[PDB]
Each structure stands twice: as C-alpha cells, then as structure tokens.
Design an enzyme around this catalytic site. Structure first.
Site, PDB file in Angstrom:
ATOM      1  N   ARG A  89      24.524  -5.920  -4.852  1.00  0.00           N
ATOM      2  CA  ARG A  89      25.514  -4.846  -5.270  1.00  0.00           C
ATOM      3  C   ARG A  89      25.326  -4.634  -6.803  1.00  0.00           C
ATOM      4  NH1 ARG A  89      30.545  -3.675  -3.106  1.00  0.00           N
ATOM      5  NH2 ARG A  89      29.819  -1.820  -4.744  1.00  0.00           N
ATOM      6  N   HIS A 102      46.149 -11.552  24.698  1.00  0.00           N
ATOM      7  CA  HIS A 102      44.318 -10.589  24.240  1.00  0.00           C
ATOM      8  C   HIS A 102      43.645 -11.082  24.459  1.00  0.00           C
ATOM      9  CE1 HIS A 102      47.487  -9.130  21.100  1.00  0.00           C
ATOM     10  NE2 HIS A 102      46.899  -7.930  21.628  1.00  0.00           N
ATOM     11  N   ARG A 142      32.983   0.402  -3.824  1.00  0.00           N
ATOM     12  CA  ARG A 142      32.365   1.433  -3.245  1.00  0.00           C
ATOM     13  C   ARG A 142      32.809   2.775  -3.546  1.00  0.00           C
ATOM     14  NH1 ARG A 142      30.657  -2.646   0.874  1.00  0.00           N
ATOM     15  NH2 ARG A 142      28.216  -3.083   0.806  1.00  0.00           N
ATOM     16  N   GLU A 176      45.541 -17.008  19.095  1.00  0.00           N
ATOM     17  CA  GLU A 176      44.956 -17.743  20.462  1.00  0.00           C
ATOM     18  C   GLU A 176      44.043 -18.661  20.671  1.00  0.00           C
ATOM     19  OE1 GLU A 176      45.532 -13.590  22.512  1.00  0.00           O
ATOM     20  OE2 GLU A 176      46.678 -12.927  21.801  1.00  0.00           O
TER      21      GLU A 176
HETATM   22  N1  LIG Z   1      28.439  -5.796   0.781  1.00  0.00           N
HETATM   23  C1  LIG Z   1      29.188  -5.968   2.486  1.00  0.00           C
HETATM   24  C2  LIG Z   1      27.628  -6.844   3.147  1.00  0.00           C
HETATM   25  C3  LIG Z   1      28.618  -7.663   4.124  1.00  0.00           C
HETATM   26  N2  LIG Z   1      29.826  -7.643   4.661  1.00  0.00           N
HETATM   27  C4  LIG Z   1      30.936  -6.764   3.710  1.00  0.00           C
HETATM   28  O1  LIG Z   1      31.890  -6.893   3.863  1.00  0.00           O
HETATM   29  N3  LIG Z   1      30.377  -6.350   2.440  1.00  0.00           N
END
Ligand SMILES: Nc1ccnc(=O)[nH]1
Ligand SMILES: Nc1ccnc(=O)[nH]1
Ligand SMILES: Nc1ccnc(=O)[nH]1
Ligand SMILES: Nc1ccnc(=O)[nH]1
Ligand SMILES: Nc1ccnc(=O)[nH]1
Ligand SMILES: Nc1ccnc(=O)[nH]1
Ligand SMILES: [Cl-]
Ligand SMILES: [Cl-]
Ligand SMILES: [Mg+2]
Ligand SMILES: [Mg+2]
Ligand SMILES: [Mg+2]
Ligand SMILES: [Mg+2]
Ligand SMILES: [Mg+2]
Ligand SMILES: [Mg+2]
Ligand SMILES: [Mg+2]
Ligand code: NA
Ligand code: NA
Ligand code: NA
Lengths: 251, 252, 252, 251, 252, 251
Positions: free
Chosen positions: D220, D5, D165, D77
C-alpha cells in the site's frame, strides 16, 4: 450589540459582569426585587431577564429553562454581552439519608450525566465550580442559618430515567441508569439536578466563573411530594442566599 | 493486627493517625516528617517509605506513593484499611499557563482524568475533585506562606511523555488522542500537568475519604527563561512547609 | 551526552547495552544483576534503581519500573532514548484459573488492557502483545528451568484492589465496570492478573521496541485474595533465574 | 444434528478436530486436494466444506466468506461439531515499505477495526493467536523458503474506508480512519486484512486455538488496487504453507 | 473501463443500470433476475453472484452480498463505482415480537447498529435509516402482495449467535454487552434481528445512495411452534416478488 | 391524575391522544387558534398548554422549551396523561446549499448530538420517526405547496459549538465538533436543530409515535440574520402544515 435568543443588548445590562441564573422564568423578578432598582428587560421563550443593582453595581438576573441546552444559550449570550460570573440557584432532590429537606447544597463537582458539557470539553474534564464562587456560596448559606452540605451533584439530562425514577409511563429505565441511584449514594453523591454539569463544564473551560447552590425540596429516600410551607421557606431562603453570595463576589 | 501487603505496617504502627501526607518521592518522606515532632521511621518497601510524626500532639503519617495512579491507589487503600481518612498530596510541578510563575503554588480544584486508575473507582462522568475542607486548608496555608496561589484545574496524565504532549522522545510520536492536547488544555484554562491527582481525587471522593493536592511551581514550559538553583530550592522547601501547615488546619 | 530526566544515567553509563531486564521492585535490581558478570550500580532515584552487568560478554541493563504503567512508561522511554531496544519484564502475579499453581510461571501472549497508559501510545483496538522472539525465549527459559509454564492471556490492571475484583478492602465495593470481571476473565480463559504488561506491551509494540513478560504465580485467586508470604521467596528466585536465561537467548 | 448454515453433521467430519478456513469458497477444493482422500461435503451460501486426510488424520476445509460476521458463523458451527483448532489463510495488503508482494505474514496480534470481536470480548481484550498455532505457522512459512514477517495486523470490517482507500465512489474516508494508514505504519503494523480480529478474539475467549497466515498481494505504499499478475503464485504458496502448519499441529 | 476488484464486472456490463437488488444468498440472485426481462449472468466470484435484467425497459442489477456488513460494503461500493445509486435489500428473517407472524413482511425504518462496518462510514450518532422513497415503495409493494406488513426498527448484528443473544452454542456464553439484550430490544419495540442493514443503511445514507430493506420473517424467537414447509416456501417467493415490485416503483 | 411540571390533569385534555409540541411557548396559542374551540389550560416554566378540537377530536398543544431535557419532561408527562402521538414543529438552520430558506424539512432520522436520547436507548439505537407520522408530515407539507426535503437532521445539545458556530465569546469549538459541519454536509445531512434526537429516540423506544417537521429560517452557507417577512411566512406555513399532519393522523 444584540444576541439571538435573550432579546437584550450590552447597553441594557448597564455594565453588569455578574448574573444570577435561576431555572424558572417566574423566579427572576423574585430575585431581582431583593436588590435595588430592578428593571424588566425582556422575556423570550424560557428567558426572562431583569437588571438590578447590588451595592451600587449592576447585576443581571436571567432564567435558563430546564436543562443544559437552554442553559448553554443563556450563558453564552450573557458572556457575549460582558457577563463573566454566573451564580446558579435552584431546587434539588437529595439522595443521601443525612441530607434533610430544607438543607442547602453547594456543588463542589458534578457527575456529567448530560450531553451539552461534551460540547465544551471531553468527558475527562472536571465539571467543577470556581473556588471563589463556591466559597461565597458556602458562607452565604451558612450565614442564613441553613444546614449546608458541600459535595458532588449528579447532573442529569432527564428528570425521569436519568434520576432512576420508575413511576413513569413505561416504568423502564435504560441499562445505563439501572442501579445508578444506589451507585451514586454509595459514592457519596448528595443530590440530583439537571443543569450544573453543563454550566460548570462550560464555564470552567471558557474563562467564566460559575457555581451552584440549591435548596433541598425532596429526599429520594423519603417522599416525592413536598410540603408547601416547607418548600416556600426553602425557596425564599435560597434566593436570599444567592444574592448574598453575589454581594460577596462583588466586594 | 494485620500488616498490609505492600506498605508493611500495622494499625498500631500509626499510633492513631487519621491523616496522611503523601508525597511521590520516597526520599521526601523523611524531610516532611522532620518538619513535625518526634519523627519515627516505620517501613520502606518498593516505592513506599512510611514515617509517623506528631503535629500539635496528634499522630500524622507520611507515606510516599511513587509515580502514577496505580502505585498511589495501593498506598491510599492500605492506609485507609489502617484508619487514615484524610490524604494531603504535595509535590512540585511544571505549569502550562504563561501567567503562572516559578515559585507560585497550585491548589487543584479538579483534575482532567487522563489516567486509568480513576476508572477503577468511578465512571468517567464522575468529577475528580478534592474535598472542600482540604482544598480550603491548602489555599489558606499556601497564601499564608506569602506565595502567589492559583486555584484551578490540573491535567492528570498516566504518562510523562506523550500524555503531556512531549515530542522530545525516542519516537517523536504522539498518539492521535494527545496531538494538539496541550494547546487544548491551555485554552480551557488548565494550569498544569501532573500524574497522580485524577486517581487520588476520584478514588477518595467516591470512597468517603478526604483528599486534596498542592504543588509548588518549579518550571514553566511556556516560558523561555530558566529558574536559578536558589528559587527552585526555596520552592521545594516551601511546598512541604505549606502541606504541613495545611495538615495543621485539618486537625480536629 | 544527555542524562535522562528520571533515571539519572547517560548513554555512556550503559556501555552499549541494547537489552534491559525490568523488574518492578528496586530491591530486586541488584539480585538480578548479580546473576550476571561484573554488575555495577549506576543510579537510584525515586522507584528507579539502575545497574549494568555483562551477559555472555554483552552489556545488559537492569532497571526497576515501580508499580504500574505510568512509572513503567517513564523507565522504558528513557532507556530507549539511551539505545535500549529489548525489554524483558519479570514480576509476580495472581492466577485466576484453578489449574495454575503457586510457583508456576506464566508467559503472556497478550494482555487485557485494564490500564490507562497503554492508551497514551495506541488506541484501545491495538493489541497488547509481546514480541514473538521474546515470548519464545521466555517459554524456553521457563521450561528449561524445570518450571510448570503456561502461555496465555493476562489481565493487566491499573489497580491491585478493585480492578482485580478484590473485596477485602476499606470500602468493600467494586465499581460496576469490574463487578463480575474475575469470573468473566476466567470464562474467557485469561490466566492471571498483574499491573504493568498492558502498558509495556502496547508501548513497545507501537514504538519499535521488543518486549515480553514472564511472571511467577504467588496466589491463586480461586483460593483467596491476599498472597501468602511463605512461598514468595522461592517463586521470586526462580523467576529471576528464568528471565536472565531468556535474556541470554535474546542476545545469541 | 446438522448445523444451521454449514449443512454438515459431526459424522461428516470423521473425527476432525482441525479446520483450515480460507475465505473464498472456490479455494476449498484446492486446499483439500493438497491432502489425501479429499471429499466434498456441502456448499451453501459462502460456505463450501470438504474433508481430507493429513498424515492419516481427518481435517476439515471450510470457507468463511469475507468478514468477521460470516467467519464467526463458520467457526461457531464447526466448534459445535468438535473442531478445536482453526488455521486461517488468506491474502493481505502490506503497509510497511520493506514487505514485498509474495512475502508471508504470521499475525501476532490484530488491531480490532471490526465489530464482531466485540460480540465475544470487550475491546480491552487482545486479538491474539494461540501460541502453538502461531509457532507452527512461523515454522511452516520459514521452512517453505518464504520471506516471513511476524507482527501486528490491522483487521478491518471494510476493504475501502477502513483500509484508507480513496479511489472510491465518494473519495471520502470518515474522520476515524483519516490518516489511519500512516498511523498504523508509524506503529509498526505490517498489513491489512478483514477477518483476523474477529477470528482471534472469538477463539482466544472461547477455548479454541486459532492463528492466521497471509500472502502479501499488494504493498500500500505503492498503490491501492492489487495487481493480478502476482495473485496466483502468492495464493498457491500460501496454501502450501497452511497445510504444512496443519501437519505441525496434528497430535 | 475498469473491472472492479471483487465483483469482476465493468460499467458496460451493467447496461446503464442505476438500481440494484441485493439479496444475501448467491443462489437467490438468479431467482430474482428471472422475475424480470432478459436476465443474463455476468459474474460469480466468492460470495458475489451478479446478474443483469430489465424491468419496464430499464436495466437492473441483481448482486448477492454474502452474510454481514463487511462483504455487503464491498458489493455496494463496487456497484456504486459503476453507476448504481439505489440499493434494495431483500431476504427473509426471524422476528422478536409476538404480534409479528410467519409470512409477514418487515420494512426497516431504522436499524440498531450492532455491527462494525457502519462505523467505517459515519460515527455511531448517525442514524442507520433508509431512503424514504425506497421504504415507501417497499411498504406499498408489500401491501399489494396481500402480506401483513410491519414498519419498524431492526437490530442489525455482526453475529448470528451472541449478538442475537443465542445461548445454544459451543460455549453457552454471551458477553456482558449482549446479556439481556433481546428483552431490552423487545421492550423498545424492535421487530427483528438480521446482519446487514445497519451497514447498508448507514453506508448509503452517508454516501448519497438510496437504500432500503424488506424481509420475510422465517422464525419468531417468541413462538414455540415450527412453521410449515409450504408457508416458508410461500414467504420466500413473496419476498422476491415484493422487492421486484418495489424496484418497479422506484424506476417509475 | 396529576404531573410534576405541566400543571394539567388528564381531565383537562378531554381525551386527547395527540399532541402538537412546538418549542416556543408563544407559538402554542397560535397553533391552537388554527383549530376549533381553543382553550388555555396552564403555563408553568417553559410549558404552555392549550387544548383544541380538530375534526371533532381533542388535540393538545404543549411547548417543550429548548433542548432534549425539557422536551423529555413534557413528552413523559403528556404520555402519563394519555398522549400517544407527538408532532414536533419548529425552526431550523439548513446546512446544504440546495435547501433554501423557506423550504420545509421532514426528518427521517437524527444524528444524536444530544445527551437525553442516551437516557432512553444506547447510541446504537436509531433516532427514527414513526413511519405514519413522517408520511403524514410529508403529505401535509407537500400539499401546502412548500418545497419539502426528507432526510437526516443533526440534533445538537448546543446552539453554538455543537453547530460549529465560531462567532462566540471564546471563538473556540471543542475538538469533537471541529470540522463537523463539513462532515455532516458531505454525509448529506440537511439541517441542525436541538430536540429531535431526544424526541425520536425517546418515543421510538417507548411505544409512542413521533415525527418532526421544520421550516428553514437560515442557511448556514448564507447568512445568520433572517429577513422578517420571509421568516413570518415560513413560520405561518409550518404551523398550518403541522395541523394538517395532525388531521391525517386522527383515527
Ligand atoms: N489490500 C488488501 C489485500 C487483500 N485483503 C485486504 O483486506 N486488503
Ligand atoms: N428530584 C429532583 C428535584 C428537583 N430537581 C431535580 O432535577 N430532581
Ligand atoms: N512537567 C512536569 C513536571 C513535573 N511533573 C509532571 O508530571 N510534569
Ligand atoms: N494477585 C496479584 C499478585 C501479584 N500482582 C498482582 O498484580 N496481583
Ligand atoms: N434469527 C435470524 C433469522 C435470520 N437471520 C438472522 O440474522 N437471524
Ligand atoms: N441554525 C439554527 C436555527 C434554528 N435552530 C437551530 O438549532 N439552529
Ligand atoms: Cl493461593
Ligand atoms: Cl504492489
Ligand atoms: Mg437524619
Ligand atoms: Mg432527616
Ligand atoms: Mg448494577
Ligand atoms: Mg528494603
Ligand atoms: Mg467527599
Ligand atoms: Mg469493611
Ligand atoms: Mg438557494
Ligand atoms: Na429548556
Ligand atoms: Na510507581
Ligand atoms: Na460474507
């Protein structure tokens, strides 16, 4: 009050709270006629249902069909109609060299190689009989003159690959079951059959009393084709035994 | 001639014993041994205190296990290497059913495998069930004592706290697997929680060894009222008298 | 205030300690405590012996765990209820790599979860990993002692026998899950077997507690199954010197 | 001679035994240009490959694409061509309230919410970094003046449901992942990303040294979709850190 | 009005498209788009190259996925947010059955879920199966191109190497799960390995999206012969002709 | 040759290589009588077996009983006797509001809520019909004038808890199955039945061609007790459809 599959009502059972549950519909009448006033109630699908009387008490005899799924329907619907104690009788294949054709086995616990047991309790839960029923079955079996073994049964959703049979259309056994008969042998497991894991798990987790007794028709270390007279004798003894175990439970 | 690695005893030390009584608490070993004849201290290492005694002229071992399947598995294995074939577990327990009273006895007919060590002997499908003769002997001894006896399923947990759905803890957290689990087991008819039977029963049932478990009830989590000191003392004493009588019934 | 259920100590008994050293064997508790200042016996019940001591003027607890995750989980929980937040585990281990010698030290960077109690805190996907500060302190302490030190993955088993793929046993059998497992772990670079780290590390990493494990090698499993007794005393002595110095580094 | 690859040979790497492995092929040249004598080697699919020199030693920079599967190909690889140490840099979403956008996380272990890790080791095996790499990454991150957190990372095969999410086409999350973000938060997990479980498990079980550093681009507890305004500076900081960590790993 | 986070396109950019063709390789996107009318480049970010085109007067999207379920899952989700409801996967593939020849086409009727991302949409019990209309259209388009077409099961792996039981690797090791697996799948009638279908089909079948997969076979794990350059070129061209014709059938 | 359960020999099948496999033994004669020269062969347990002729070719009709275990025996033993194509017909409960009582469903894949499928292939393997059989069933069903749905079927080892029925003896459903009907509804699953996961997995992994067509007798969003004339008409159409699908499969 009616049920979806069995075709009987509560009234048809005449107050029965104990059922004898063979697998084969043809064996229902054979068991019922060992008791008083047997009466045919219904036949639908694999479910043939009779009532009879034992020491003056109503008993139901109902076939299950092969496997946990059809067994689970019969047990549920009988429980809806007031049955609380379930005595399974059937045939089995022994896997231990010391267990002879014609011996009897009373299951103390089952290896859950089924699927329907998981519809009642997660895999951690033990597929174990009610102790009174197992005790009654042992006593009845011994009193018949049989050689009786108490122990663990492997309960499989298939007759063929889950019992590690290779003389089949494909001749293959999936990875999970390759080497499994030797594994169970070395762990002391006595026998294979196809309903006890479902029955025992369902009942033990649902406030129902259950147990299983079986006549050994083949030994997997020996041959697959039973001798007819020996098998007939074993089958006749098994049903005499289960009726006597019922008598002990009703005393 | 070998001395086993953890227990520190030899086959000769056991004087021909083929049956062991296996409490959890090392301090209980001498108490049980003294219910029998000619009790002799053999060794104490870690959680393993080992005595021998004589019951109707036959040698019996008493060996503590510690808490949990892992330490139990070592004691059972090492005793089996030295000729022991029958294992009688005793103790006291709480109960999770409202009908099970303090002072009653429980004889386990099968265990919910909420442990890890059982899987080192048999896959999860395999039933954690006692030997029928041992269970029968335990029921008879328990009933002959005059106690109310319950035969049924025990939930056997690798933890005291989250696996028994206890929230009165440092974090107050129970992992998803165990949230709602006590009510689930209650609804399934499970009698009690403890921490060794799944390992013990699975190990023995899959290894050609005879095992069972009996326990006196000292508390009930569903019940508001607290048992007095006298009832608890009586229950502990009855539990070990019962296991010795069950051993008597097992002797050949 | 409260006395915790198993350990039999109160928060006041710990004199403000927020760090515990947690060996397995109750007999080793006093041996660790005496390496520090003003050691005092607090309690002994079952496999749990508890001492307090002082290290660079700060209170420290030493508490045995017993063998296995289940009994360890009780001690950690109850110490955390009483304010302990950092847990340093010392014990013995069997190496499975040919180059690791008896007397070497291993500091676990992560554990293979071959236990059950870890699942009572976090699902299997969760890593059984130490606190980075604790692992760093243990590495430094081990090196400063003159020991040969290895950092890496540890296989943490609920059994001593089949889960460490030992065959010189009563049955001489190992369940399918564990057949070939020692070679598999060896090929994956795993250093060693022991019996508590998966539970300890998973419990602590998912509960806001800092933990780490250091172990002295008492056997190389490429050589034999049962550890020799002649080299065990020296290995045990260096291990506890190391864990106390690691504790000093954590209190700084 | 040429791996399947990546389109490079061992000779192309000029003796490199360390690779920096970002996700985005467009970031490869940026990382390479922080070092000396950057040379473009190949680009195919998600795999852009450069070499450069760091303190006189050859280093590879190779993109992975998103996810464990494409990462596993690149690592394998590169290992076939002599690479033994793998430093992963990327972005991440924090799930702890105290962790801010622009902070740096060095993973001490990953929650294996992937699939490819299971192709190297069973689930019981820890997704753990090499201790030397983690040590180097912590030192580089702290020396840079960044705010640095060491701890557990949840590594998901999806960006959407596996990171719980809901602002999605279905607005649904499968049972397994319902409530999972709060569960990981309660367990002290710092962050979500998509490659560390695979990378760390593969390497820790294959005699390769690996670690992961990530720049926080979203918290989050605040929202689901990252703000663009802070992406560039966080990304720039992260790659300077990983290059310094590479310097610390050179022998 | 939003721009999706990874693909960098808006709903308006797609000009009403409700069908996407989703190759793996970004370089193949333009090659597919140019088989249709009015191809226009929309965006390229990471492994995602996105074009729009027109097929019988209807807007179509072409978007690369990258290798593997994780990157595929992002592209499918973000396109679905922007109104796409039908997803046609193309590529080329090896085969594991002796009767499947180079230049042949495979249309997947179901996938062995040897991935991880499928579990983020449905539990393992759920079948990774295509929409029946898409599979039917793909079979017809493939047959109409003159190719020999095989309908059947595909093994969809999160790795190229151990999950396809390749031993020509850095370690030469395949984890226990996958040892013997290629023969197992061969004996079960599985046609081929690839790396995205289990995720794609499970995601779509459980989310109200229509999906299917068609491929060209580029290697056969059972044949020693090396396929000729012209044959490979022809196969690549045919595969994309076929997927565009399958899209035409879906739009009718 | 002979088999253990079905009570028929290869000669009895008169060269048949296709079987129609209803669940209920009473449906076997009904299906056979839609074809030419129907002949009763055997009845044992839940297994009633007939032969008939369709466009001059021999066809076997054999009941399965309820559940994967009994189905697996019938399929294996018929395969031992030369059968290679299996067309399942039966009844089903729809779970989608848009799927009406009297509609037909052709399964494109099954949710494996059974146990016996695992005796043939691990859970990862898809419970998938043969494409030719599914195509034939769709064509036959549509040509009949029925409203036909293609899609996913949930195939359960129980009628009660695994289909999330609460009007039962205990009124409880194990945690695994709590909320499951809504979950399947949201995932677009059409219906519940009890044999397809076993049948399809067994056949797809064993070189046998299988598919499933079903008439909708109940909708779980509506009522549990079917109307008799509606049910009769649905059952009659289903068996005419399966016979026409068999005709389409003949070579
Ligand atoms: N909230 C996120 C930001 C960046 N990458 C992720 O997988 N998740
Ligand atoms: N061998 C067997 C005989 C009878 N029943 C079974 O399930 N297996
Ligand atoms: N509640 C309990 C009492 C005693 N032992 C236990 O394990 N649990
Ligand atoms: N081999 C071993 C030595 C010490 N502890 C263990 O668990 N294993
Ligand atoms: N052998 C293979 C060729 C192409 N793609 C794969 O995933 N595998
Ligand atoms: N609801 C249902 C009707 C028929 N069969 C089933 O399994 N379920
Ligand atoms: Cl050694
Ligand atoms: Cl934010
Ligand atoms: Mg004999
Ligand atoms: Mg004999
Ligand atoms: Mg084997
Ligand atoms: Mg001592
Ligand atoms: Mg036994
Ligand atoms: Mg021996
Ligand atoms: Mg309607
Ligand atoms: Na049946
Ligand atoms: Na212990
Ligand atoms: Na990718």
């Amino acid at each position: 009050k009616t049920v979806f599959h069995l075709g009987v009502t509560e009234a048809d059972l005449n107050g029965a709270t104990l059922a004898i549950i063979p697998g084969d519909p043809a064996r229902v009448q054979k068991i019922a006629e060992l008791m008083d006033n047997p009466v045919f109630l219904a036949s639908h699908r694999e479910y043939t249902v009779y009532r009879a009387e034992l020491d003056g008490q109503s008993v139901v005899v109902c076939s299950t069909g092969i496997g946990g799924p059809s067994t689970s329907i019969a047990v549920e619907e009988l429980a809806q109609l007031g049955v609380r104690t379930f005595l399974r009788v059937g045939t089995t294949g022994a896997i231990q060299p010391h267990v002879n054709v014609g011996d009897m086995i009373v299951t103390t616990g089952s290896v859950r190689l089924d699927g329907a047991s998981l519809h009642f309790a997660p895999m951690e839960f033990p597929a174990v009989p009610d102790f009174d029923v197992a005790t009654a079955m042992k006593a009845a079996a011994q009193e018949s003159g049989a050689t009786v073994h108490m122990g663990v049964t492997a309960s499989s959703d298939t007759f063929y690959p889950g019992q590690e049979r290779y003389d089949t259309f494909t001749g293959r056994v999936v990875r999970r079951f390759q080497g499994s008969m030797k594994e169970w042998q070395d762990m002391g497991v006595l026998n294979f059959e196809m309903e006890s894991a479902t029955l025992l798990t369902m009942c033990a987790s649902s406030g129902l009393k259950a147990g299983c007794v079986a006549g050994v028709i083949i030994n997997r270390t020996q041959k697959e084709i039973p001798d007819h007279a020996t098998l007939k004798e074993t089958e006749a003894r098994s049903i005499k035994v289960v009726v006597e175990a019922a008598r002990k439970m009703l005393k």
